[PDB]
Structures are given as structure tokens and as C-alpha cells.
Amino acid sequence: STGSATTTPIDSLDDAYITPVQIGTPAQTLNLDFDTGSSDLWVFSSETTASEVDGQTIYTPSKSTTAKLLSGATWSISYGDGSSSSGDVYTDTVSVGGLTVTGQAVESAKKVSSSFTEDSTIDGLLGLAFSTLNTVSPTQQKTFFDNAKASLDSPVFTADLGYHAPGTYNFGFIDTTAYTGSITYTAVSTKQGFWEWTSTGYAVGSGTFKSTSIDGIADTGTTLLYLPATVVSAYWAQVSGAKSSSSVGGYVFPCSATLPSFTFGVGSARIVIPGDYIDFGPISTGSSSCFGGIQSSAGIGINIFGDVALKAAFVVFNGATTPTLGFASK
């Protein structure tokens, strides 16, 4: 089997992407944030504290003939941005782009933090990291991908995120028309539960390539590119007037600037992030100070190849017995 779904930016800055997901019988369609940095599929629901719902579409398990309470199971998660949610668990039928899993744990939110409430466009998350990170207790549950894997034509999914435009998540096959040149595959460590890999270096604009190992995760649920402070300093030093602002919370730059590109290495191959991808616009409405899309990972404790990086590539998440990551230009 295969699946293919379109994923759409939630706003004009590509702050995140939502992908329609069918849950239950009859189908209830929720727009979820596909997140290769976490491993819970959780949804706004009929159980969510009413004051914490503001425009989201909810899952109502009592209207699904295939929903079953997973008795005793609870969940609770906190993300790298400080947001969080928690609740109980149903199993139900879940389909993405024609691909169906029966008995998928659907984690029903009783509580969500303010940032989820404030984002009316995201109805929940669908995690695609490794199931070892799943927070369901006392019986850990599998991701949608994990559940689907054996039935897939090939044990893979691919992320093809657009820049200010829709893209595609595919399950079970590699669309050879969706990228240019060849796909370069690189080793993954699952020891932290993430799609963790090592980039072979970077260049800034037309500058020379610096060979240097950068350990990081491929994370579709993170907006920006977070890298070591040395690398980030080297990038922003090429932008006149750019500076790190503690008050704002990162590197800002004059909105009048033309940003240089940023290249990262995948083995002997190179992925180029155009400078426009690194512009996240005025720090506040009408400001002439703009927020940068490359930020320091210092104090995160890990480097994150978020959407800024991943949307410059066609990315294969290979879930074979020995998992690997593939990157192609597009």
C-alpha cells in the first residue's frame, strides 16, 4: 500500500504545515501537524477543556463507530518550544492520503497549553519520530508510520515541504519525479528516538565550504534551522546590521537586507537554502527589524534541521531495519 497527502503552510511565513487526516467512522477530518521530532498522534477533541479550544476542529470519539477507549492509558507531552498537552487515549481507524491504519492510538487532549489554543489552524499533531518516544502510559503506543510499515510497498515516508506553497507527504514510495539529481543517503542514530544524522558541513552564500561534522535531527515540527553558535555567527556576519537580540530572542536583521543562501552538506552532496527562505519577517507588525530563520541551538542541547532546511530538499525517511535519511535537491 501507499499514501499521498498534500501539506499546506498555516500562514504566510511557513510557521508550520498542516496535513488532512481522516479519523474514525464516519471519517472525521482533522488538519494535523506532521512532526518527525515527536511520536504522539494527539488531537483536539470533545474532551478538551472548552476554554482551551478556539477555532480548532475536534475529534468526537462517541460519534465514531470504530473508536474504543484504551482503558487506563494516559499521555502527557512537552515540546522543545515549551508547549504541552495531555489527555487519554482511544484506538480508531486513521487514514492519511488513502493509507489506512486500523487500531491506531489516537491521543485525545483534555488539556493543551496556550500556544496550541492560540493556533486555530492546527487540530493536533501526528508524530513520525521513533515509537520509543511515545508518551502513552502504562502501555507505550506505536506511531502511524510504525503501524503502517509492514503494509507499505517500501518502509519509507518522504517529506516534500514547499516554500510559501503546498507540498507533499508520501508513504510507502519514492516519487522519482519530485526531485532533481540523485538522492544522497546518510546514516541515522535512533538512540535518542529521533531521525538523528550528521551533516558534513556548511557554506554561507558563495563562500567556501567548511567541512565539519554537525550532528542534528531532521524535524518537520520545528520551524527554523538551529545550528551551533559558531556556524550561526558566521552566517549572520554576512548580513549588514544583523545582530543577536536577547530582548527579541535571537538573530534579527534589517528588513531592507538581501539575505545570502546557506548550504549544508549531506555526505558529498550539498543542499542550498535560498536566502529568501531565511526571512521570517518583521519581529512585530510594521517593524523594520526582521527575524532570522537560522538561529543558535546553544541551550537547546541539540541541533535541529527544521522546516527552513527541510523545505529546500526532498527528504526520505527510510524506516528499514537499519534506518537512514536521504536528501535530494528539487
**Reduced to 3 states, what is the DSSP secondary structure of residue 183?**
coil
The whole-angstrom separation of Cα 28 and Cα 63 is 9
Experimental approach taken: X-ray
Q: Which three cell numbers stand for residue 2?
A: 501507499
My answer on whether 242 and 267 are in the same domain is: yes
**174, 189, 208: which is the final residue of a domain?**
174
Domain, as residue range, for 258 = 175-330
C-alpha–C-alpha distance, residues 201 and 211, integer Å: 5
Catalytic residues: 35, 199
* 104 and 236 together in one domain: no
Q: What is the distance between the alpha carbons of residues 277 and 22, in angstroms, rounded to a whole number?
A: 31
For residue 145, what is the enclosing H or E element?
A: helix 144-148
Question: What Å resolution does this PDB entry report?
Answer: 1.7
Could you give the CA distance from residue 179 to residue 170 in angstroms, rounded to a whole number?
A: 13
Among 174, 204, 232, the domain boundary falls at 174
**Residue partners of 5: CB distance under 8 A and separation at least 6:** 19, 20, 21, 96, 97, 168, 169, 170
* Whether 315 contacts 327, CB under 8 Å: yes
All 3 cell numbers of residue 58? 475536534
Cell of 303: 541541533
Same domain, 165 and 228: no
DSSP for 228-249, written as a single string = -HHHHHHHHTTSTT-EEETTTT
Phi, psi of 173 (to 5 degrees): -155, 160
Which cell is 130 given? 521513533
Same domain for 97 and 189: no
Whether residue 246 sits in one domain with residue 184? yes
Q: Are 200 and 328 found together in one domain?
A: yes
Q: C-alpha cell of 247?
A: 530582548
Q: What is the dihedral of CA 83, 158, 173, 66, to 10 degrees?
A: 10
Q: Do the beta carbons of residue 292 and residue 283 sit within 8 Å?
A: no
- CA quadruple 42, 48, 54, 58: dihedral positive or negative? positive
Same structural domain, 10 and 147 = yes
Q: How far apart are CA 25 and CA 126, in angstroms?
A: 19
Q: What is the rounded CA–CA span in Å between residue 298 and residue 134?
A: 26
Separation CA 50–CA 301 (nearest Å): 35
Q: How far apart are CA 270 and CA 31, in angstroms?
A: 33
Query: Do 190 and 318 have their domain in common?
Result: yes
The total of structural domains in the chain comes to: 2
Q: Are residues 146 and 234 in the same domain?
A: no
**Beta-bridge partner residues of 90:** 69, 106
Same domain, 94 and 108: yes
Q: Which of 128, 154, 174 is the last residue of a domain?
A: 174
Q: What CATH number is associated with residue 250? A: 2.40.70.10
C-alpha cell at 228: 551551533
Nearest to 254 by CA among 291, 285, 289: 289
Does 146 lie in the same domain as 210? no
The answer to whether 97 and 22 are in contact (CB under 8 A) is no
Residue linked to cell 498522534: 41
Cα separation of 270 and 247, whole Å? Answer: 34
Report yes or no: 4 and 168 within 8 Å, Cβ to Cβ.
Answer: yes
Residues 54 and 166 in one domain: yes
- CB contact at 8 A, 110 and 87: yes
